Amino acid sequence: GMTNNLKQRRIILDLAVTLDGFIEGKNGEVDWCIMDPDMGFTDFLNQIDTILYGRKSFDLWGQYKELWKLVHSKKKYVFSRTQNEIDNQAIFINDNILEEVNKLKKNPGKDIWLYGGASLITTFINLGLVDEFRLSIHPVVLGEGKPLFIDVKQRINLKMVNTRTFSSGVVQIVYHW
C-alpha cells in the first residue's frame, strides 16, 4: 500500500494573448480580451490553491461575480515590483524571487497561478519558472503592447497538450514546458 504521494506543484500562466504576442496593450489595454464561459476557468481555479502577484497587480486587480469568490478564496502571495526610474522599467532581484518561489514549493498544496503583472510574468518565464502556458490567443493584431515573450536567450521548446476553439475565434493552446 501507499505510504506517501507527492504531486509536484506547478506554476501556471493562464492568460489572453494577441495573435502578435501581446498580453496587454502598451498603456495596459485589455479591452480586446474575451471571457468565455467554456475556457475551463472554474476548473482551472479548483486545481490551484495559490495566486502570485507583483505589488502593482495586487494593488489594482488583487482584492476586488462567482469567479471572483473563487479567485479571492485562493491564498494570495505578493512579490516586489520596484520601478527603476532610470529606464522606467521593473527591476527585480532574481535570487530573492527563486528563494521565495522555492519556500512556497516546499509547502504541501495544489497548483499556483502566476497572475501578473506583465513584467513579473516575463521574469518568471526567463527564470525558467513557468510549467504550463494556458494561452488564449485572440483573433487580433494589436501592433504594439506588452509581449508575453521578451528578452528570451535560447529557444524554449514546448509540448502542446490542449487545443480549444470558441465561437469568438479565440483558440486556447495549452503548452507544458
Place this chain on the structure above:
Amino acid sequence: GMTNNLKQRRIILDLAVTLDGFIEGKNGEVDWCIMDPDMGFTDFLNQIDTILYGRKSFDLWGQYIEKELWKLVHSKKKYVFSRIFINDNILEEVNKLKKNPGKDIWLYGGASLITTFINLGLVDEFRLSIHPVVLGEGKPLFIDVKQRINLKMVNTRTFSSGVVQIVYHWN
C-alpha cells in the same frame, strides 16, 4: 440560368510561425520548421495559380528542386518584385495582377515583402502554422503595424508534432 461567375481572387499567406511570432530566425533560420503531409498543402496549391516572391526569396526558393509538391509549386505563374519595397509600385503591380481571371495567389516571401503586403491591407487569408517553439529572436510576421487588425478564425488544425495551424480571414 447563369451568364457570368466571379470568384474574387484571394491573396493568401501560408507559413510556419513560432509561438513568439517569428517566421524566420535572425540569420534566416528555418531549421525549426515542420512540414506535415496533413497540412492541406497539396489542396492549397491546387487552389492557387500564382506565387508572389521578392527577388531575394525567389533566388532561394523560386527554383528549388516531396519532389511532387515542388512540381506543383513550379507549375504556377510567378511574380518577382524588386527592391526597400515601395508601396505604390506593389499596389500598382497587384492591381494589374488582380485584373486577370483565375484562382488564388500565394504570397511566398520574403519577410519584408510579406510585411509590405500586410501593412497595405493586401493579405486576405493567413494560414499560420504555429510551432511549439519560442525562438527568442528573429523576423516577426507582424512588424510596424499602425492599427489593430481584426481577423475571423475559420479553421484550427492540430498535428502530432504539437504544431497548430489556425486559419484567419481579413474581412
